[PDB]
Structure 1
Amino acid sequence: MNAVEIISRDIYKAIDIQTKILDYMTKFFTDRGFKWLLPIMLSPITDPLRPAEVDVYGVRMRLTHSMILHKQLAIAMGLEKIFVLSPNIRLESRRKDDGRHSYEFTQLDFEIEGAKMKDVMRLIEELIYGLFRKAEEWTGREFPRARHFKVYDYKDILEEFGSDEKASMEMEEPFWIVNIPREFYDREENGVWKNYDLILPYGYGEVSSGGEREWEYEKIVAKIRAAGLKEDSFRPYLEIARAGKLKPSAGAGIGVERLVRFIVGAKHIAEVQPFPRVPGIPAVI
């Protein structure tokens, strides 16, 4: 699509839904006493998940992969409960152009001081359930009805369906995948990862991801080294961890476009974006 074709698409309904979704979600969090933060796009540190880079007054800065580390820093500042509509940049290859990836997207990213994994899962369930009932009033269609979703261990997913891909295809209710070996910020205890991904049914895939966090220096540094990452990619973060100023917390990020896609029923996520950002295809506009 050239520039003129991009702007000649019909996208009014998807944007209408998006507006209702953003209004609903931001209110859900402010009603529960969350502080509303603004995002940052450039920092010496970002989610390790190679991040694009740019020089800023002579210093190399990474474009934000995600704000996970900054959420932990906000908790360390004593903000208690925070969320942000955070734009992310993730330059995946043509292979990830599967209808559910975009190389620029926003997540509603939130964190809570002292929360446990079941608290956050329950909180997301409350949000999704309320939202699905509204989506029925908005679009005169029917959505998944469960108040709580089934919980699968990552290994049970691999065993029964082979992949989270096949899992999503087979299901008709959202479902959780838990205990997923991941990054250094996710808390691991007794070989169990205290983390969680909410998966949508009908092949739509992941919509939310989160976990309890590591806050202890030695444990964090061990997992970084263990993964073969350079500790100096996280220097200022590790200095706050060393000062013992990280606090226990838990949170998650919700993919806004993925949620909008599900509620509108769009085949490709590009259809709900006024300016598509398709993996492997540099945007025309």
Structure 2
Amino acid sequence: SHYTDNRYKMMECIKDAGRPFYPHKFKISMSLPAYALKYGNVENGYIDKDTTLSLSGRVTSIRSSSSKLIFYDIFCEEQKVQIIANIMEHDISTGEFSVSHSEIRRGDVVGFTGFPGKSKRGELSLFSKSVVLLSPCYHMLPTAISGLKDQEVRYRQRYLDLMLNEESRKVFKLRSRAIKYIRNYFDRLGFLEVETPMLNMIYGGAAARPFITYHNELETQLYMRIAPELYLKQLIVGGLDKVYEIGKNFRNEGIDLTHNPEFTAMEFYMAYADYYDLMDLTEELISGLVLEIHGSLKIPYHPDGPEGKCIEIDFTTPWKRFSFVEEIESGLGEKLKRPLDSQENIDFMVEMCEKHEIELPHPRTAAKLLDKLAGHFVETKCTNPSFIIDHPQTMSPLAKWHREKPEMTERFELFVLGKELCNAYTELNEPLQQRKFFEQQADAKASGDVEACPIDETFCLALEHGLPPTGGWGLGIDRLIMFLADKNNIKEVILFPAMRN
């Protein structure tokens, strides 16, 4: 592009002519938002020639109306301000007027000094005496994201999206706001926020394939964590009673509209809670947060982008419960075989998948087949926030056996519009069973289940020191933002999402 080349040449001409080249420090008098706050309500034509002020931002517009007069718009911290540069007011010690302004291009980061007020037409303005080129833009910028080459430019060059698209900036402010609300909710309950390792000698705490790496000096392989669950429960053994953690998990899996290989999760562990308590807390936290952002519990959503239809999500509590096995059997019209992990039920579930054209998982463990059946018959019923509850033990190796239902656990997942938001349970705190389920996990992994975890002996030893009855819970922060901010693509709520190619 000839434009980038010429700009470099211009900057070389500036630097070798002794003129301002990338000044180190520009001292603004106030922000542009502060400027609009102080001066936005003056009368049209008002100017305070007794006050000199320095302002800075990115040039979004240049218009020379005459040989004597140049109009700029600059933008900074969500505020636009017009600069009126009149040759009569020009500080000639900064160079001749026409030379000073010939160095400026739309998109440049620049400073101005001048008198505050309002043009006779009512535009909030600075009547400038000087202009300083702080940081030039070397590329021709479009006017909006609509002028970009493709819309993947928004994700690969996020600075362009943030520069040109106010809706993108709003998303990441909302994301911060929601996380603040969430922290405050648990801080007020007396929780302690902790950090537990993202480098693990043994990965665990979820059904997910890990990233593998290696520590040279300790001569050992490590896994990026797929979940903090196993460390956090050890803190409850240690007596901290209420802990939470907000941070990244790493899952070496495919990317789609609701999966990024790193994502932000919150987990908390509350001694003496069970999953009934956790269901009530989930409803209270999420509906409070929805109310905080939206002013009611019925919020809009565009499932096919904003050129599509607009639906309503109703967060009114209490939310519907679906029982895992019962809702599958209602969809099938017959019962699963018992025990659920028998070879007989495994064969039956295979024949049910092929009957209902459900893509088989690999390998064909009972847990993975149950999950496929659930995704087909149950998760698709979850339009408004719904709990899917009481998952079979065989697919929940860390959830405590259900106090009433054989073969099930005290577990729930929260689903919104068929997408999973939360995973939670009464915690398994019995070491014999826990060891047994770890062995079954290790067996599945050895059979090719890349989402099954190895046995963690350190964790079994911790349970032998006595984990109090405890309730635990995990939430996908990014997926929460998708719903709060009305995005159907997770790449909209992560600043630098993973991209192919």
TM-score (norm 2): 0.51
Output the amino acid matched with 1:79: L
Deviation at 1:66, TM superposition (A): 0.2
Q: Does the 8 A contact of 1:177 with 1:196 survive in 2?
A: yes
Amino acid at match of 1:274: L
Equivalenced residue count is 274
The alpha carbon displacement at 1:4 in A equals 5.3
Residues 40 and 86, structure 1, Cα contact 8 Å, conserved in 2: no
Q: Does 1:148 align with 2:148?
A: no
Q: In the alignment, which residue of structure 2 is the partner of 1:218?
A: 432
Q: Shift of residue 163 of structure 1?
A: 4.0
Question: Residues of 1 paired with 2:274 and 2:319: CA distance?
Answer: 17
> Structure 1 residue 237 and structure 2 residue 451: aligned?
no
Q: 2:203 aligns with which of 31, 46, 52?
A: 46
Specify the alignment match of 1:277 in structure 2. 498
Question: Deviations 1:131-176 (Å, cap 9, x if unpaired)?
Answer: 11112139x9555241210110112443456644665555442000
Residue 236 of structure 2: aligned partner = 75
Which of 162, 165, 188 matches 2:401? 188
> Comparing both chains, which one has the higher relative contact order based on Cα–Cα distances under 8 Å and sequence gaps of 6 or more?
1
Which residue, out of 184, 191, 210, partners 1:27?
Answer: 184
CA distance 1:248–1:46, change in 2 (3 Å): farther
Give 1:252's aligned residue: 473
Question: Residue 291 of structure 2 is aligned with which of 112, 133, 145?
Answer: 133
Tell whether the 8 Å contact from 1:150 to 1:175 is kept in structure 2 after alignment. yes
> What per-residue deviation string (whole Å, max 9, x for no partner) do you get for residues 208-230 of structure 1?
11111111211111112233168
Larger displacement relative to structure 2 (181-190 or 210-219): 181-190
For 1:53, the aligned partner's letter is I
Contact 2:399 2:409 (C-alpha < 8 Å) held by counterparts: yes
- Greater CA radius of gyration, 1 or 2? 2
1:263 aligns with 2:474: no
Letter in 2 for 1:18: R
Q: CA RMSD for the aligned pairs?
A: 2.6
The answer for the alignment partner of 2:414 in structure 1 is 198
* Secondary structure of the structure 1 residue equivalent to 2:436: helix
Identity level (%): 21
- Cα contact 1:216–1:244 (8 A) shared by 2: no
1:174 equivalent to 2:358? Answer: no
- Are 1:7 and 2:163 counterparts? no
Answer yes or no: is the 8 Å Cα contact 1:46–1:67 preserved in 2: no
CA deviations 1:47-91 (Å, max 9, x no partner) are 252322222221222110001101111111111011010210011
User: What CA distance in whole angstroms lies between the structure 2 residues aligned with 1:179 and 1:170?
Assistant: 16
Distance 2:237 2:489 in 1: 39
Distance 1:213 1:31 in 2: 23
Tell me whether 120-129 or 9-18 shows the greater mean CA deviation. Answer: 9-18
Contact 1:66–1:86 (Cα < 8 Å) also in 2: no
Q: Deviations over 1:243-284 (max 9, x none)?
A: 333332111111100000011111211111111035xx37xx
Q: Find the residue that maps to 2:295 and give its secondary structure.
A: helix
Match of 2:173 in 1: 16
- Aligned residues of 1:117 and 1:212 also touching (Cα < 8 A): yes
8 Å CA contact 2:382–2:415 kept in 1: the answer is no
Q: Which runs of 5 or more residues in structure 1 are unaligned?
A: none
Structure 1: how far apart are the matches of 2:481 and 2:158?
19
CA contact (8 A) 2:324 2:374 kept: no
5+ residue gaps, structure 2: 1-151, 301-312, 332-372, 447-452
With over 3 angstroms needed to count, the CA separation of the structure-2 counterparts of 1:42 and 1:136, relative to structure 1, is same
Q: Secondary structure at the match of 2:321?
A: strand
Q: Which moved more, 1:223-232 or 1:252-261?
A: 223-232
Counterparts of 2:288 and 2:317, CA distance in 1 = 9
Question: Residue 224 of structure 1: SS of its match in structure 2?
Answer: helix
Deviations 1:159-205 (A, max 9, x none): 4566446655554420000112323211124322110001113x4x1
SS at 2:259's partner residue? coil
Counterpart in the other structure of 1:37: 194
Asked if 1 retains the 8 angstrom alpha-carbon contact of 2:196 and 2:231, the reply is no
Kindly provide the amino acid, as one letter, of the partner of residue 175 in structure 1: S
8 Å CA contact retained: 2:237, 2:465: no
Matched-pair contact (CA < 8 Å) for 2:269–2:471: yes
Higher mean alpha-carbon deviation, 124-133 vs 150-159, is at: 150-159
- Alpha-carbon contact 1:51-1:90 (below 8 Å) kept: yes
Q: Quick one: structure 1 residues 165 and 100, their matched pair in 2 at CA, closer, same or farther if it must change by over 3 Å? A: farther
TM-score, normalising length: structure 1: 0.86
